[PDB]
Amino acid sequence: KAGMEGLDKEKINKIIMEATKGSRFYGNELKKEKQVNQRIENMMQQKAQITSQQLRKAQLQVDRFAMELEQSRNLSNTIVHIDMDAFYAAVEMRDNPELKDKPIAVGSMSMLSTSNYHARRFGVRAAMPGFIAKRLCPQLIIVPPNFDKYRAVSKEVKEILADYDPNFMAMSLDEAYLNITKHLEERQNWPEDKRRYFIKQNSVVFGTSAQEVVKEIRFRIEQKTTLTASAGIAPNTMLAKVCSDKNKPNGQYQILPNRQAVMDFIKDLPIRKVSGIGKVTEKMLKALGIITCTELYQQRALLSLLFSETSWHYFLHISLGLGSTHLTRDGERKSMSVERTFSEINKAEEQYSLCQELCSELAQDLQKERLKGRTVTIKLKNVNFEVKTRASTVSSVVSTAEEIFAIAKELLKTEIDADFPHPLRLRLMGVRISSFPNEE
DNA sequence: GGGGGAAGGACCA
DNA sequence: CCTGGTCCTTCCCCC
Ligand SMILES: Nc1ncnc2c1ncn2[C@H]1C[C@H](O)[C@@H](COP(=O)(O)OP(=O)(O)OP(=O)(O)O)O1
Numbered sequence: 001k002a003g004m005e006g007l008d009k010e011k012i013n014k015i016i017m018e019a020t021k022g023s024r025f026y027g028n029e030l031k032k033e034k035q036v037n038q039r040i041e042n043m044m045q046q047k048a049q050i051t052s053q054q055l056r057k058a059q060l061q062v063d064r065f066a067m068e069l070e071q072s073r074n075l076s077n078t079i080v081h082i083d084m085d086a087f088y089a090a091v092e093m094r095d096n097p098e099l100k101d102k103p104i105a106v107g108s109m110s111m112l113s114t115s116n117y118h119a120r121r122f123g124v125r126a127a128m129p130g131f132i133a134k135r136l137c138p139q140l141i142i143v144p145p146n147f148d149k150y151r152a153v154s155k156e157v158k159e160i161l162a163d164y165d166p167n168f169m170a171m172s173l174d175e176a177y178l179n180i181t182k183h184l185e186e187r188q189n190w191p192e193d194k195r196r197y198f199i200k201q202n203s204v205v206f207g208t209s210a211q212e213v214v215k216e217i218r219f220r221i222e223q224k225t226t227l228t229a230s231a232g233i234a235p236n237t238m239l240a241k242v243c244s245d246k247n248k249p250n251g252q253y254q255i256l257p258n259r260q261a262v263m264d265f266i267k268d269l270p271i272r273k274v275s276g277i278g279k280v281t282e283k284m285l286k287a288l289g290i291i292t293c294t295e296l297y298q299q300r301a302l303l304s305l306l307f308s309e310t311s312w313h314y315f316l317h318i319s320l321g322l323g324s325t326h327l328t329r330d331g332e333r334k335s336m337s338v339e340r341t342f343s344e345i346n347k348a349e350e351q352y353s354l355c356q357e358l359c360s361e362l363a364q365d366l367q368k369e370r371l372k373g374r375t376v377t378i379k380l381k382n383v384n385f386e387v388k389t390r391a392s393t394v395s396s397v398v399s400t401a402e403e404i405f406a407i408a409k410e411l412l413k414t415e416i417d418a419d420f421p422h423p424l425r426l427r428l429m430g431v432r433i434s435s436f437p438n439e440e
Numbered sequence: 441g442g443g444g445g446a447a448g449g450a451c452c453a
Numbered sequence: 454c455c456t457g458g459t460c461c462t463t464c465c466c467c468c
């Protein structure tokens with residue numbers, strides 16, 4: 001929940017319910033929850049078994065760990081995270097003035113991808129189904145999305161970000177972390193004319209602090225596109241995205257560099273607000289009485305010893321308010337994917353056709369990167385939202401519609417047999433290549 | 441006990 | 454009446 005707080009959780013939750021109480025959807029959730037509740041046992045059972053001297057041991061390992069992490073804590077880097085405001089919604093607003101002063105969302109009667117801050121006041125939020133959305137906000141306008149138009153604006157803004165961290169990394173069409181560390185240096189000595197801007201004595205000049213560059217950045221981005229950004233300044237990434245959001249929309253927040261500011265901040269930060277901690281992790285941790293970063297730190301004894309090697313590691317890094325100061329080389333596609341939702345299809349002949357066209361879709365997108373891949377998964381969601389998923393891998397490499405349909409076909413084939421003499425009643429079918437070629 | 445491969449999930453925009 | 458990606462953790466089965 002990030003955008004508009006101060007909401008009538010009462011009326012809004014009743015309404016969200018009515019349109020769910022008996023919905024096929026609700027069912028799968030309602031019993032996906034049983035799985036969450038019973039996983040908690042596994043953990044609480046594995047706690048009861050934990051002994052005193054065990055924890056005593058578990059400690060020193062961890063404490064040590066905390067130590068050098070703390071000795072290696074880096075604060076010379078100034079990391080910024082730019083996050084756009086109601087991004088798709090904000091573009092659409094811009095492009096079609098008729099929508100200026102109206103609650104909108106970008107999406108579909110089945111699901112909203114985002115919504116303007118206006119609509120947000122009614123309770124409409126991203127990941128919400130439109131049909132529910134319009135029960136909270138009768139006058140909500142649902143624009144269909146047009147990604148080629150959003151890519152348009154992402155590119156546009158990046159032409160700015162270039163000028164500051166020409167090696168920034170961008171998380172999405174709407175987010176990028178930057179590192180002004182370098183820029184701020186040169187920027188100490190710019191004259192004011194290197195920093196004066198015209199505002200569409202009507203003209204302004206930005207000073208020389210990090211707080212002042214992110215001011216300037218957000219300015220230029222607003223002046224170019226009419227869209228606003230919130231931005232979060234800190235000395236690593238984790239802290240940055242959390243800051244970006246502490247003054248949305250149109251605003252910015254700085255944790256200055258030193259152990260305290262970070263601690264000052266970290267102390268009562270509800271664990272949920274960190275990237276990568278979600279509905280579930282929260283419910284688990286919260287089940288151990290962990291709610292705030294601090295509570296997380298001081299539970300570290302138990303967590304290292306109850307969770308996976310990589311998880312408690314992560315947990316701990318947050319405990320101390322540690323992230324990453326180096327922005328990484330572009331990356332590499334690990335997969336490509338295409339899936340689609342539809343009214344029930346329980347006639348096999350159709351299921352196969354749908355697949356063919358999905359594979360056809362995929363292969364084309366694939367061609368556009370001139371990439372070839374040697375594994376393949378179908379996804380297939382029952383009309384109860386229960387979801388199976390089947391993989392396969394060739395030895396050579398696959399690349400086009402037909403050839404990669406030859407695998408999809410047989411992957412499905414078995415799953416029809418498997419449930420035969422029943423048809424697969426379906427809502428969602430999907431298909432994705434994986435694998436890759438590198439140098440050699 | 442590794443590691444490559446399939447089945448599932450968590451969490452992210 | 455609920456919409457492309459990554460990166461894990463469990464089994465598996467090869468060695
Ligand atoms: N669940 C989703 N499905 C499809 N598209 C999404 C989804 N969530 C987010 N997006 C797209 C639309 C969002 O505008 C965009 C950026 O995400 P995010 O920054 O979380 O929201 P936002 O920029 O629209 O609002 P905010 O002002 O809170 O940032 O990514």
Ligand SMILES: [Mg+2]
Nearest residue numbers: 272273274277
């Ligand atoms: Mg989070």
